[PDB]
Symmetry: D2
Subunit: 106 residues, 4 copies
């Protein structure tokens, strides 16, 4: 999907996680966020529409997505361990990464 | 791109790295390998054409890709620090991941 | 060194990074922070004086340190690439991990 | 503990894992390996007895330990998830990191 699409999936599922009861729900939202962050990898954000896929800026843009994926990766391990609250907190702590990218590139 | 496609890109660029001279070329192959692993995320491998995108087998399939992406992520940092040999050895060490997935799922 | 000791080193060096000018200084503080987090691993926090080194509470306690070590690991790659600001900021985003552990275990 | 000590703990527990019948056992060996790897962080290997802690060689030495720790971290999530065989295989694939460091620095 497109960039703004993937972002919505990220945002919608964050909320699903905030409010979830049980591990199953959390696993699911995380799985969708994971796919969304992976698909987002290829994108070019408007603010650097011109630049080439080699700018220190594209390389730094894409870096924030490795961080995100690493973190979704780990949050999900917690969910598989039935550590519902610990996973929910890992999800809350992702926002730091979301915000970090947004302040630079959005 | 398709899954066999992405696998070719992975395998072609591993050779490019094996034989490369200087930092710049290594960076490039890894970058291409990164994109390929990210796209490969959403894929369903023939051996699991039946199971839904939730079976412990799909979750495990995709797990192997987080491992690889993390490892490509790190080799590329090495390439940026002008440590070329270190980066090729990280590249060679990846294979341990390639092989691991292949003998479960290929 | 002791737990509170290591925490001081973590906190002191965070500030050193906040205010640093150039790559070299950032590398140093992170290096010191790395060693402090690694040494912190074996520690038992007062609040879990009650639990053996196998409680889902010690394992979770130690988990927070893997997160931090990974994050120090990555900040430092940034510093080696001379990306001073990018590093300083990775450093800022760490606090999310500090805070997360403190809220649970301090 | 000392460096050769930590290496024994790593090697002994690798075996314990290769042998191990049930998940509880695997968790234990990995936990011991993680502690060992963390404590090994601060060590200076004979081959680099002279060099200051700031040589690209000490930096690279310690780097191999972050890799190791990252992989022990992950293998343990597999164990908590009751996936015994997958954890065993993550453990075997660690050897790649052991060997990599030994060929350079042992
Ligand atoms: C992390 C979990 C995360 C969230 C959540 C998130 C949300 C988000 C929203 C809701 C938008 C759009 C606002 C709107 O459409 O009105 C948005 C947009 C962008 N994001 Fe984002 N985002 C998260 C993560 C990240 C990360 C990690 C990056 C970079 C590494 C990133 C980047 C962007 C960009 C660029 C946009 C705007 C694109 C556009 O509008 O054309 N996001 N995000
Ligand atoms: C790691 C860098 C990596 C490489 C290299 C690689 C190569 C590769 C090749 C050459 C094929 C060829 C198929 C053919 O000739 O018919 C192939 C196919 C598959 N792969 Fe792969 N692969 C690497 C990594 C990984 C990882 C990390 C996974 C699992 C997450 C994985 C899986 C698969 C699967 C399944 C196939 C079968 C697809 C098919 O033949 O239709 N690979 N790969
Ligand atoms: C992250 C880099 C980080 C910082 C910074 C930090 C700071 C810190 C302070 C300032 C104290 C109080 C000491 C004093 O007043 O003299 C403190 C104490 C504890 N910490 Fe911490 N800490 C950081 C990281 C982490 C992480 C990642 C964890 C757990 C996984 C953690 C835990 C604790 C605990 C527990 C204490 C109190 C225990 C005690 O012996 O009093 N910290 N930290
Ligand atoms: C990975 C899990 C791993 C294992 C296993 C391992 C084992 C090991 C043994 C058995 C020895 C020999 C001990 C002796 O000299 O009596 C040994 C020695 C060294 N190792 Fe090791 N080691 C593993 C991992 C790693 C890693 C990741 C590094 C470096 C980053 C590393 C280093 C060393 C070094 C140096 C030695 C020699 C020290 C000495 O002989 O005094 N090991 N290891
Ligand atoms: C790899 C080694 C190197 O020196 N360079 C250029 C120098 N440089 C840094 O050391 C940090 C940013 C930078 O440009 C490399 O690219
Ligand atoms: C997954 C979460 C949960 O609690 N259970 C039951 C017990 N169990 C584990 O927690 C890990 C392996 C195991 O059987 C789950 O299966
Ligand atoms: Cu898309
Ligand atoms: Cu769309
Ligand atoms: Cu759209
Ligand atoms: Cu749309
Ligand atoms: Cu020791
Ligand atoms: Cu001893
Ligand atoms: Cu001894
Ligand atoms: Cu001894
Ligand atoms: Zn974890
Ligand atoms: Zn690294
Ligand atoms: Zn990085
Ligand atoms: Zn022994
Ligand atoms: Zn994992």
């Amino acid at each position: 999907a497109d960039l703004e699409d993937n972002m919505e999936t990220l945002n919608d599922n964050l909320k699903v996680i905030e409010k979830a009861d049980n591990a199953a729900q959390v696993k699911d939202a995380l799985t969708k966020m994971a796919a969304a962050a992976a698909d987002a990898w290829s994108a070019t954000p408007p603010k650097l529409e011109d630049k080439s896929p080699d700018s220190p800026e594209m390389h730094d843009f894409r870096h924030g997505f490795w961080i995100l994926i690493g973190q979704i990766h780990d949050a999900l391990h917690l969910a598989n361990e039935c550590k519902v609250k610990e996973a929910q907190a890992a999800a809350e702590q992702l926002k730091t990464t979301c915000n970090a990218c947004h302040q630079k590139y959005r």
